[PDB]
């Protein structure tokens, strides 16, 4: 059980105790997904409005 | 009222418990996957402990201790006994055992075997695995080389344990036996030893010559099927105690049961910090089957601990009722057959 890396200041202290040793999507891709979801909402609304016009 | 679920259809013990609960008028059985239960009679394998104790307003209890497999698998029992300082390498009631894969103790086993072959001491060992379910996959041999080849043919972990060459033999018959003790640990980690045990006996005389014949050497009830000395190769404590009094001028309590109680206490106290559900968001109890051997000096030896034991037929009623009184109704009360092993 060894203590290492003891650092002290007026606010407190920090240290390590060892008990045992061991044995992205782009901007365009995001806006594509957003717009694909928006167009699917637009499609469903147009189907609704078409159904209502009937 | 109270609710429970059943997830091991193959449990003889808890089918009877379920039957008792229903016939109190205060328990209702729900479907297997209804999460709103008070009590879970869980599956043997992959039990979802992580889903227990998160139902608002339900006190939840389960009939298994998470982590008790450490005691109830032959491999981990050996590792537990060796590496637990409270059991230590110096433990005197567990036969010399080694875990062998086809961590691994292949070399240290041969080192003690060499001392035995050089010493001309009795050098007979038995190799088994908890994966060898019900009378399958056991080899007893006086040659270490022959034992290992048996392990390599199967693809699972085995333990090599010193076969007890000098067992206590019942008379008449010159015949081997083992002792099963049932132990209930409740949610408070009280340890309750059921008053009644059973001796599983061998029907055929013990023969120290050939270990090729595994019938007078394996006491397992399934392997015996027989019955001429006792009904079903089972002798109960009243008879065995009367035998010990008549043939050996001693009692079951003095010569054997004090040791059995010591061994049960030692094993279960050892793993208590790792499995206790005191201060957990759900509670456990479990019924255990401890298997012991007795040698000719009336020394008791632990062979294995079973985590999902069956019971002797004429004892199902009493013991299952005891499970309800002590383990279930103590948590869920409605509107002794056990010996409490006191500890810490």
């Amino acid at each position: 059980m060894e203590v290492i890396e003891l650092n002290k200041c007026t606010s407190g202290q920090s240290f390590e105790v060892i008990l045992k040793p061991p044995s992205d999507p782009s901007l365009e891709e995001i806006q594509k997904k957003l717009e694909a979801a928006e167009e699917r909402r637009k499609y469903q609304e147009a189907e609704l409005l078409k159904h209502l016009a009937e | 009222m109270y609710t429970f679920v059943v997830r091991d259809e193959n449990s003889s013990v808890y089918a009877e418990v379920s039957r008792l609960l229903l016939a109190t008028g205060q328990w209702k059985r729900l479907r297997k996957d209804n999460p709103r239960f008070n009590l879970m009679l869980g599956e043997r394998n992959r039990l979802p402990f992580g889903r227990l104790g998160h139902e608002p307003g339900l006190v939840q209890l389960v009939n298994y201790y998470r982590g008790a497999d450490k005691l109830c698998r032959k491999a981990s029992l050996v590792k537990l006994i060796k590496t637990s300082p409270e059991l230590s390498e110096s433990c005197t009631w567990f036969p010399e055992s080694y875990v062998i894969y086809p961590t691994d103790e292949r070399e240290v086993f041969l080192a003690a075997y060499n001392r035995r072959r050089e010493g001309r001491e009795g050098n007979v060992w038995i190799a088994k695995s908890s994966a060898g379910a019900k009378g399958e996959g056991i080899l007893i041999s006086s040659e270490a080389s022959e034992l290992l080849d048996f392990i390599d043919e199967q693809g699972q972990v085995h333990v090599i344990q010193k076969y007890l060459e000098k067992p206590l033999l019942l008379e008449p018959g010159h015949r081997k036996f083992d002792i099963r003790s049932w132990v209930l640990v409740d949610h408070l980690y009280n340890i309750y030893l059921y008053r009644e045990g059973v001796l599983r006996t061998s029907s055929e005389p013990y023969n120290s010559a050939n270990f090729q014949d595994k019938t007078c050497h394996l006491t397992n009830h399934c392997i015996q099927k027989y019955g001429r000395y006792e009904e079903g190769n089972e002798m109960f404590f009243e008879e065995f105690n009367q035998y010990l009094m008549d043939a050996l001028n001693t009692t079951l309590e003095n010569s054997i049961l004090l040791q059995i109680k010591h061994i049960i206490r030692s094993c279960l106290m050892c793993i208590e910090p790792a499995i206790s559900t005191k201060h957990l968001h759900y509670q456990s109890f479990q019924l255990f089957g401890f298997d012991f051997m007795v040698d000719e000096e009336l020394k008791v030896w632990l062979i294995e601990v079973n985590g999902a034991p069956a019971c002797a037929q004429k004892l199902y009623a009493e013991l299952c009722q005891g499970i309800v009184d002590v383990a279930i109704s103590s948590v869920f009360p409605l509107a002794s057959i056990f010996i409490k092993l006191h500890h810490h």
Partner: protein, 423 residues
């Protein structure tokens, strides 16, 4: 988050008027629209149902529709008749003669654009319109036929707003004409497609509660409507008062409707008493789940609950409420589907209704509601197989096919409930 309220036809306007009496009282609003309450909790969410006119007057966001003037003259003469914005009375002179086709296709079609003009004028002055609630019966002509025509025109103009109805289901026990099963079946078809939530108020259950429980030998519509206005106050409590949990119409529909067509709710209320006696929390909880307290004449033990909302009003032990709610589920463990976890929600509001120290309102989405639609479908078929009374409808330009389609769709709805009752 404003709500626009519409009430159509005789039933719709009489139950609507009582709704506004009750919630005006709860919010401290007198019959002249002046606030005279004693708690800021009364005004905090008052804009959900009222506009603020100059002079600190509150005006219901309410539109009153009918094809004959009679019931709306009664409302204007009624107790709170003067709070309604006079421009929001929209009525004809012809009537609809208890005839869905007159409400939906002929007489109603002449009036509906005027109604939509008023609806549009209310929506335009909404900071953020939540949606619409319609009160109406399904057994007559104006509320049933013109009401569902209105719902269809509102959805077309506001397809992204929530549409809710309180719909009174006909019963032979409290019947005006024999054609009610025709009118109700044509309406259920509309509601299946164009509402997000329908509170099914069964005149059979309302009658039975008045007769058996309230011990009223001869119930009147006034007596049935007391039960409705109290239930309506309960179900809208979580929209009208600064209760936590932050519930608007859409959040309510999201939590109550797991499949779009299965949005027909069984409401319930407790207490119903034939009194000054203190009602304990166990009693409220037991009663609100009792079939005898439910306003759709369906036995909940004949099906399974998909979702449940339970609203407690008054000052009571929250811990005792949670306790009793968890208790009632265990006594009814079979009757909740196991494949929607935690499908029972409990809400509390400190403001009790008038004259009660505490009460509880139940909203169940139960598969047992299929019993209501089975009753109607039986009564529909008994007449329709002999084409009885059909000339009243074919004389308004309808074809038999349209009756066949509406019957098919209702029987599909029934089998849908049965399918999830066994899942």
């Amino acid at each position: 988050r404003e709500i626009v309220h519409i009430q159509a036809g005789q039933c719709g306007n009489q139950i609507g008027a009582k709704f506004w009496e009750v919630i005006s009282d709860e919010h401290g609003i007198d019959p002249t629209g002046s606030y005279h309450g004693d708690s800021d909790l009364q005004l905090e969410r008052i804009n959900v149902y009222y506009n603020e006119a100059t002079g600190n007057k509150y005006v219901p966001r309410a539109i009153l529709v009918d094809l004959e003037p009679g019931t709306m003259d009664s409302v204007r003469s009624g107790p709170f008749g003067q709070i309604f914005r006079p421009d929001n009375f929209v009525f004809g002179q012809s009537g609809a003669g208890n005839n869905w086709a007159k409400g939906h296709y002929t007489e109603g079609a002449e009036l509906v654009d005027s109604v939509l003009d008023v609806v549009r004028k209310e929506s335009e002055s909404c900071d953020c319109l939540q949606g619409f609630q319609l009160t109406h019966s399904l057994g007559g002509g104006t509320g049933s036929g013109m009401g569902t025509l209105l719902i269809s025109k509102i959805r077309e103009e506001y397809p992204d707003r929530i549409m809710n109805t309180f719909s009174v289901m006909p019963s032979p026990k409290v019947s005006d004409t024999v054609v009610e099963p025709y009118n109700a079946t044509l309406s259920v078809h509309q509601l299946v497609e164009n509402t997000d939530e329908t509170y099914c108020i069964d005149n059979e259950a309302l009658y039975d509660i008045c007769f058996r429980t309230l011990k009223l030998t001869t119930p009147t519509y006034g007596d049935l409507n007391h039960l409705v206005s109290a239930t309506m106050s309960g179900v809208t409590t979580c929209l009208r008062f600064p209760g936590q949990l932050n519930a608007d119409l859409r959040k309510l529909a999201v939590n109550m409707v797991p499949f779009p067509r299965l949005h027909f709710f069984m409401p319930g209320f407790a207490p119903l008493t034939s009194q000054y006696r203190a009602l304990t929390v166990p009693e409220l909880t037991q009663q609100m789940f009792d079939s005898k307290n439910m306003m759709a004449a369906c036995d909940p033990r004949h099906g399974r609950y998909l979702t449940v909302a339970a609203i407690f009003r008054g000052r009571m032990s929250m811990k005792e409420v949670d306790e009793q709610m968890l208790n009632v589920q265990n006594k009814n463990s079979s009757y909740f589907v196991e494949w929607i976890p935690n499908n029972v929600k409990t809400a509390v509001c400190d403001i009790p209704p008038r004259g009660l120290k505490m009460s509880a309102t139940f909203i169940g989405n139960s598969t047992a509601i299929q019993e209501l639609f089975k009753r109607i479908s039986e009564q529909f078929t008994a007449m329709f197989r002999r084409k009885a009374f059909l000339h009243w409808y074919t004389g308004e330009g309808m074809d038999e096919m349209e009756f066949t389609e509406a019957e098919s769709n209702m029987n599909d709805l029934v089998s849908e409930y049965q399918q999830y009752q066994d899942a």
